[PDB]
Design a protein around this ligand. Sequence first.
Ligand SMILES: CC(C)C[C@H](N)C(=O)O
Ligand SMILES: [Mg+2]
Ligand SMILES: [Mn+2]
Ligand code: NI
Ligand code: NI
Length: 353
Amino acid sequence: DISVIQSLPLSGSQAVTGRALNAGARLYFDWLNLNGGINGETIRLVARDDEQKIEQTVRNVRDMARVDNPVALLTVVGTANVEALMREGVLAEARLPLVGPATGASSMTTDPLVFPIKASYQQEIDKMITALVTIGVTRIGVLYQEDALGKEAITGVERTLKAHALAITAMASYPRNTANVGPAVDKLLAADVQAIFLGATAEPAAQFVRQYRARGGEAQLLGLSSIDPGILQKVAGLDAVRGYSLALVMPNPGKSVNPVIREFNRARAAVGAKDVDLSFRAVEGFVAAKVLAEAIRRAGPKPTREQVRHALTELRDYDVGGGFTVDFTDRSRPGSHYIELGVVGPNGLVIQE
Ligand SMILES: CC(C)C[C@H](N)C(=O)O
Ligand SMILES: [Mg+2]
Ligand SMILES: [Mn+2]
Ligand code: NI
Ligand code: NI
């Protein structure tokens, strides 16, 4: 078989996110296999829980790269986790391409073996923050994770605001791999802010939103694509989440007619993956897997790690469906140039524009 590996959080604070990315990728490959696989070959996806622990991501990838004979690695979660794989030379040692890292950090476009797909965090921040400034907002607060993710958020928001002669009004942090946002909620509730940007992961974002609103917080809420709006409204409650602003960097699960969403639903039914729920992060995994599959297909029979890498670097506007194209020929930017703003409607529907 042709093997592909994944190291992500299947337990712990980030379990919801890791499970979704794995579910989407597994769904796509099971679907591909039901349809004949790739050039008559079966694709095997091997996953391993890293609990989003940086050192465990490193160990997992190195171990799997040696034992599972993979041609590529898919959707690793955590800016700090991926940066460790790059910094410690794990990918270089295995000559293993990382397709679709589940983070839009700016560093994702600085490694020959890393192939970011979705529009970056900076693109998200520029679009969302500029929209706020354009409508008159001048007082912005920021919730940030106390690690590389938070640094990306603060630096990014500060950069965009500086372009408009503005600066962050208040900021508060929380520990990575936890949802301990109590102190942050206290601080931002006291701040005289009109909007609060969430540079956080799913669980802490949800806890912050629920608590902030429950205690009288009225600021407009918005955040990075690291926060699935579907999960957010489920955990924090629609009463606190309706109105939440976001940047769409993947096909919207809410648009059932979108070709990628239609394929996801057809795949789910055909495979009989009752345990898999349609969500933004699951779609991200599905999309990453499909992009990798196309590269494997182009690599030819019994493809090697080198051939797959080569194929990836030559994908020029490959359409995953509905116009969501990926171009890896320019390594200085994300494969996808797609990005639009969206909002969570009164009843929870994610609407574009
Ligand atoms: C930037 C990362 C730390 C965020 C993480 N990859 C997530 O999707 O939750
Ligand atoms: Mg992300
Ligand atoms: Mn189809
Ligand atoms: Ni070539
Ligand atoms: Ni386009």
